[PDB]
Design a protein around this ligand. Structure first.
Ligand SMILES: [Ca+2]
Lengths: 236, 236, 236, 236
């Protein structure tokens, strides 16, 4: 008495019809027109000298509409139907809802997003580690700076040596600091990448997952514009 | 003895031809084959015992070719012909060039590009707004520098202290500047986001517009390769 | 009463089934419809007056569906069935999972990836070759710096000239260093290209391998979305 | 007596056959199999109870080969042929050569490359302009440096003033040079972009043309691998 329409992962639609007890089943690309379906069911139906077909939302549509708009309208109605010249019976067919279409896409999104959440925990933890290390180092450096400043002040202004004996000291100090920085540049040949490699985090995979998930979300919002809006991502 | 088709913006084709007051009007989807057009015309035409329709460019064409490919391969001559078996009439029909497709796409593209130009002008304005603040602060810095220069010149020549009391202080001063700058970075570890939130600007919408425009340009250029090349985006 | 098909690496399918010593073997391209398979089997089978073949998953399917879509929608059950009108035999046939397609693609992918790993190891070696040269030169620079430091220390404390003859010279010296470095840039306005030309390395080939590998990964992941997801590239 | 095969810009092939005086003409996607053509010509031919078809290079091929490999083989032969069960007609058909296929692609390449050559002339000329300007400036700077060095030497070592009156001079000089550099940074708020904008050169268009042309070259070399190699780009 009834038929069905179903969604596939490969953006094709799977029609099922109680056509002669033993139902027929078809695959339709959404950009195709309904005349494809009419021709194909004519091939599936018997002669009578060829039959005629009509698709209906109570209105009948033309045979040159793309499947997508027809389904938008039928989801507005929640079901559509078919009329044939000979059998004289209205074959009603159900239609997927929004979630009925976005099921596979949202499942992929949930898997990818849980993986990304784990990766984000990893990255955040090790980033804060490196953050604390660098800031402890900077605190020590500022301490050295303040010590040097107090030294030069209390020496030049409150010591019998004077600036005469102090300029060479601070010049040698500046050159030794440059030598230390140079030795450090060569000690390199930033630390976050080594923390990743030693911890197991990956970046190319990370951005790959993120990019795929963003394209997914954009397709979701596209269909949510076409279909009913307000799909509550946090609810999924 | 002549007709023509027309390009709607809905990826359909509105064929208009004389079918011997209101001439024969037909809606077509491009993926349809010519056999469906044949049956459609047969439905529109009177009896004879049904005639067989031929399409031509001469050459005789089949009945399974999609419309789009036939039109592409026809546009080198600007017209294609029909031969009905019954009426013995010569009929020719106009091929749409790149111009009509270009029209109903470029209109969307120009709307999008003008909107994007406005949005980018707004973003440019607010960028200038923050930039001039930073510029004024750097002007103040230049003023401080020149003040320090004049100070040390005065204390050198127009003073009895002499260079002996000058070199130490300024050195300490220089160190303090570094210290100050150092502290600044140490205080860091974002702002224009808030300036746009207060301005009421949309970045996701902007980027979506840009990417849609680029994709539509690519579609236009593809179909321009299908037809003759050199559609001259900058000119039109 | 059972058969199976197989996946060659040429985007064909080798069907093998019992057609009542050498069972019925058939080559298929996926874009073909099931009607061609029906006529092919009819040619292979004996007379009766020709029978009509049905395909099933229950559901009865049409005769225009491409093979690939039918297989995709069949793989949820791992088998699909045939019903011949004459013989009254029940026949079932095995659906290939993701594994066979994955096999004849992943083999190419692993070959490419291993070759790329070797090439990248070579490039890494030669990069290290130049890097160590630069490193040794910087070590020489460190030595010069420490020599200058010890020189000025000696002339300061272990010398009667005193700081008065020290500060000017070193200042000039520092300037000359800048001048030297300045001249170096002025002499500039490329080298590893020659090192690879002498090594005999191929960069265009390398990049082509990389891009082909990435595109083939994307194809695999697409067809993995078509079937069940999570093919785990890093694992296998 | 003879037929033809022709190339389209949209990677589809245009078959033309002397089939019933009034030739037939078909469009074939290269990845399709020859069984598509067999089915379609069966539909174009009369009954006899359906005819059979054979494609031949002297060998006959299967009806499940993709069109590309068949054409590779026929270009090895420079022509192929068709046989039918009832007509007993050896319908020989010609095949495009390498250039016969790459004609449109190479024409696009020539246009794009001439445009790019003009753009490259522009860029090279204005780049050399900026180059000369910057190097004249650097020569002047080096001259100032040498003047300063000679000044400080002949003053501190051959003038009655001495270092006592000179250190303040060069300190003030360094601060004034920093002030001048600071004023220069603010005079900005590199020159090649302004030269482009005032001259008319464009970059996004430039890289767009280059990217499209390189992808084109890759497709050309792909088909040159499939077909005969050594196509002599400089000859085109
Ligand atoms: Ca001094």
């Amino acid at each position: 008495a009834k038929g069905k329409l179903l969604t596939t992962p490969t953006r094709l639609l799977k029609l099922i019809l109680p056509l002669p007890i033993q139902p027929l089943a078809l695959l339709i690309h959404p950009q195709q027109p309904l005349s494809y379906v009419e021709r194909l069911i004519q091939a599936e139906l018997p002669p009578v000298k060829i039959p005629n077909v009509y698709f209906r939302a109570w209105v009948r549509w033309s045979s040159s509409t793309e499947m997508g708009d027809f389904i938008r309208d039928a989801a507005r109605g929640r079901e559509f139907a078919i009329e044939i010249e000979g059998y004289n019976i209205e074959m009603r067919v159900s239609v997927p809802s929004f979630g009925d279409r976005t099921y596979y896409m949202r499942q992929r999104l949930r898997k990818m997003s849980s993986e990304i959440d784990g990766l984000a925990k990893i990255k955040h933890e090790c980033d804060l580690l490196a953050h604390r290390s660098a800031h402890r180092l900077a605190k020590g450096g500022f301490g050295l700076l303040a010590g040097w400043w107090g030294v030069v002040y209390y020496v030049t202004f409150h010591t019998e040596f004077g600036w005469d004996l102090v300029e060479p000291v601070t010049y040698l100090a500046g050159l030794t600091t440059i030598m230390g920085g140079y030795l450090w540049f060569l000690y390199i040949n930033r630390r976050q990448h080594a923390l990743y490699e030693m911890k197991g985090f990956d970046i190319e995979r990370w951005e790959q997952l993120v990019q795929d998930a963003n394209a997914l979300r954009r397709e979701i919002r596209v269909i949510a514009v076409e279909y009913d809006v307000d799909w509550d991502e946090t609810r999924d």
